[PDB]
Amino acid sequence: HGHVGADLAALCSEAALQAIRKKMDLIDLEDETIDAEVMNSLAVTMDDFRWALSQSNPSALRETVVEVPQVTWEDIGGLEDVKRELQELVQYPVEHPDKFLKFGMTPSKGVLFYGPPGCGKTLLAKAIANECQAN
Amino acid sequence: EFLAKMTNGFSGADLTEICQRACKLAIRESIESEIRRERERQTNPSAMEVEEDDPVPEIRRDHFEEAMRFARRSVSDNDIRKYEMFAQTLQQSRGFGSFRFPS
Amino acid sequence: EFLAKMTNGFSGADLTEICQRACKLAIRESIESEIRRERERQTNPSAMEVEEDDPVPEIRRDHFEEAMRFARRSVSDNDIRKYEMFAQTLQQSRGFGSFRFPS
Amino acid sequence: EFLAKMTNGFSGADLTEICQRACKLAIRESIESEIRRERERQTNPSAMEVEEDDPVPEIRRDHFEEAMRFARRSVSDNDIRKYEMFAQTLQQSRGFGSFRFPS
Questions:
Q1: Which of A41, A128, B18, D50 has the smallest count of CB within 10 Å of its CB?
Q2: What is the CATH number of the domain that holds B45?
Q3: What CATH number should be reported for the domain holding residue A15?
């Protein structure tokens, strides 16, 4: 999830090198004039990509990321009161911007969740972003 | 005017919320109507929507009567009592009063 | 569903551990099998391994029933009681309730 | 037996209350029946009460299912944790363990 395009070019290049390296037991240095059999019958497979990805290629990325999330609403079922309130506070000033100016109520600008540690706070805060298709 | 003599010790920043509460409740009734207006079963193209619904063109009374039930005073009685004690810690003619001049 | 009405006051970050616990226990049974599969004494080349063992292709029930015995609630009763006291320190219609309008 | 594996950390003095709660609820249903049994309108003397009502001759299941909703654990998690800390402040073979004798 955290690579850049040049990192993926290096990843593909390292997978090609790994696929060549796994065939150097019969591609020997005494084969001076190289036979073209490997040049049309070698294809990189899945574990070479997994080797080049997991064992090598430290990613050149730490910073923030901007995308829609993907955790849906049925990842934490229930809590319909909280869901209905978040719909009235996030869904409606995006999916219906004109009706807010019919009677002109200014929208709010965010709530403060609070609770015990590990009740799906972040997993709920991503859910309204996934429902609104917002960033 | 009936809201005046019913909310006595409410601060000014509190009854600016209950009108945003009744606004939010009326927007909830408007999107509630627009989620079932397009949900027509046996949707005949005959008898077209030349007459619009227009369910909530303004805030009704029961929107206020429902939003008023979540009213809450922000300042307590102990802090208005604190400021009155600061008004008397201030002087405000802390002394004699009501004297006159010789003729 | 039986795990639902058995773990009542468990936090969401706690029953994400007991499925990692049952996963860890099933991986322990898989490497346990693969440390004795290759430990064949009188290893005849006849009757080859054309039928694989495949001992644990999924988590069984007793992996859960053994991993559930190390379940532990993270949050206490004193902190859920603290947040309920913060909910009542918050207003949530701290006042009159249930009034009506004159006719 | 279903009440056993549903009330885990309840003290013995707490589930002696929920059976007094379900008893109190069934007596409420019995006097509820006897306040409307004698409240017969168009009370004909014909078709006499040779068949009795007998509405609640025992506690039903929904009396328990309604009384269980007011269950409450008396002891907290902090006090059972206090007594376990007193069990380890007590010795209980606080030492070596598992030695043997010379041959």
A1: D50
A2: 1.10.8.60
A3: 1.10.8.60
